[PDB]
Amino acid sequence: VGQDLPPVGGYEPVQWRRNLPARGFRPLVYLAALCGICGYGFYRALGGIQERRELKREK
Amino acid sequence: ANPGFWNGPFRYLRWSAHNRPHLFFAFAIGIAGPVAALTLTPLRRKYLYPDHSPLPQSYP
């Protein structure tokens, strides 16, 4: 039987399974840094409001 | 699966916050409101008086 499309004389096998979570900081720091950001945000926010305490009585 | 059950409160708050947690984390905010509003009377330690005003009509 002549030259038909036979296989390769090797395989080089390929993927057949699942994949993974992306970066290393899986835990609650992905929540806790949230409490950092509000922990910064109010740190100016009320302060700006505090400064408007001086501003309102200025006018 | 198990709901919350009252009689062990340290256990109840665990197996509330772990099986139906979405009202737990609301009411944690609901207790972080007024209880922290009562832990300020030393924490301001007489920080500030606002001192606003309508028209100051004076005295004789």
What brief labels describe this structure?
part of a larger assembly, 2 chains, A: 59 residues, mainly alpha, 1 helix, 51% helix, B: 60 residues, 3 helices, 38% helix, 0% strand, rod-shaped, oxidoreductase, NADH dehydrogenase
Summarize the structure in words.
Chain B: Keywords: Membrane, Transmembrane, Transmembrane helix. Chain B: The chain crosses the membrane at residues 23-43. Chain A: It comes from Yarrowia lipolytica. Chain A: It is found in: Mitochondrion inner membrane. Chain A: The chain crosses the membrane at residues 28-46. This is part of a larger assembly, with chains A (59 residues) and B (60 residues). With 59 residues, chain A is mostly helical. Chain A contains one helix and no strands. Chain A has one helix spanning 29-58. The longest helix of chain A has 30 residues, at 29-58. Chain B is an all-alpha fold. Helix content of chain B is 38%, strand content 0%. Chain B has helices at residues 9-14, 21-32, 34-38. Chain B is rod-shaped.
Tally the helices of chain B.
3
Radius of gyration of chain B: 22 Å
The biggest sheet of chain B amounts to: none
Query: What is the rounded distance between the termini of chain A?
Result: 102 Å
Number of E-type strands of chain A: 0
Strand fraction of chain B? under 5%
Write the SSE topology.
The structure is cut from a larger assembly and holds chains A (59 residues) and B (60 residues).
Chain A: H1 29-58
Chain B: H1 9-14, H2 21-32, H3 34-38
Transmembrane segments (chain B): 23-43
Keywords (chain B): Membrane, Transmembrane, Transmembrane helix
Family (chain A): Belongs to the complex I NDUFA13 subunit family.
